[PDB]
Amino acid sequence: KKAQRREHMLKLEAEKKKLRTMLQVQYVLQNLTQEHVQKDFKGGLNGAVYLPSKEMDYLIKFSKLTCPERNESLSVEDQMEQSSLYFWDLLEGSEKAVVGTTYKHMKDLLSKLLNSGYFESIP
Amino acid sequence: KKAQRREHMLKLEAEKKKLRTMLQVQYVLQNLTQEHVQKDFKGGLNGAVYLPSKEMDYLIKFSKLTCPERNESLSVEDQMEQSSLYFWDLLEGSEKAVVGTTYKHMKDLLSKLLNSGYFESIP
């Protein structure tokens, strides 16, 4: 019973560190939709880790897919349900096909801009 | 060992249903900062569950506290760390003092606009 309590604290730290990386990834993909960012990554002109347009469009569509606008025919609860599953499959490092890539490479690709420098202190 | 796998599926559904309610609450507090909303709840003029200004300012400051703008002196990773903890203390129904209310009443108050009607199909 003593080791049963040590596992509860570890999961709380895991689900919290997840929630931290969540909002980080949300911040990355929201400002990613800006146009001055995608043109900046054309050759990395202001601290952007260079990325070809194939790898850009991979997640530029994911940003549209993961942080979308509400469908008036869809309840805004089940919209978040769909968006929440996308985020969850991303952290799992799964290999389900999505927009032409894999969820494992998605986390790696987004982790590349989670240490780039464009993700903090940007216009 | 068989019952150990049934618990993993239940936690996955719990952490997913959490992630669903998360983004719902984020959507509630983001559009909450709009001015046409707080003036609408002055007497519920377009489907708004009436709320006095004490109970409004409780969460109108929480929205500023929970979905803020980045501090240039703070790394945008630890900013999300702080915001993630606020969301997590909210779902726990805790009783820590915050902006003059309690986290248990916060979830109840926000659950009142999670079934109101102003939270779907709004300008």
Residue numbers in the entry:
A (entry chain A), B (entry chain A): 196 to 318
Which statements did the authors publish about this structure?
Human Caprin family comprises two members, Caprin-1 and Caprin-2. Previously, we reported Caprin-2 as a new regulator of canonical Wnt signaling through a mechanism of facilitating LRP5/6 phosphorylation. HR1 domain is so far only observed in Caprin-1 and Caprin-2, and this domain shares no sequence similarities with any other known motifs, indicating that HR1 may perform a unique function.
We then tried the corresponding region of hCap2_HR1 (aa S102–K351) based on sequence alignment between hCaprin-2 and zCaprin-2, and this hCap2_HR1 protein was crystallized with significantly improved diffractions. Two molecules of hCap2_HR1 form an asymmetric dimer, with the overall structure roughly resembling the shape of a pair of "scissors" measuring ∼100 Å in height and ∼60 Å in width. The structure of hCap2_HR1 could be divided into two subdomains: a "blade"-like N-lobe (aa A112-L205) and a "bow"-like C-lobe (aa K206-P320). The parts of helices α3-2 and α3′ in the C-lobe of chains A and B, respectively, packed together forming a parallel coiled-coil dimer with the rest helices in the N-lobe forming two antiparallel dimers. The dimeric interface has a total buried area of 2414.4 Å2. Considering the theoretical MW of Cap2_HR1 being 29.2 kDa, we tend to conclude that Cap2_HR exists as a dimer in solution. Close to the junction of the N-lobe and the C-lobe, a cluster of basic residues aligned along the solve-exposed side of the coiled coil of the N-lobe. Surprisingly, we found that Cap2_HR1 binds specifically to phosphatidylinositol 4-phosphate (PI4P), and mutations targeting R200 and R201 in this basic cluster not only disrupt Caprin-2's association with PI4P but also lead to altered cellular localization as well as decreased activities of Caprin-2 in canonical Wnt signaling. WT hCap2_HR1 exhibited a binding affinity with PI4P (KD = 2.0 μm), which is about 70-fold higher than that of the double mutant R200E/R201E (KD = 152 μm).
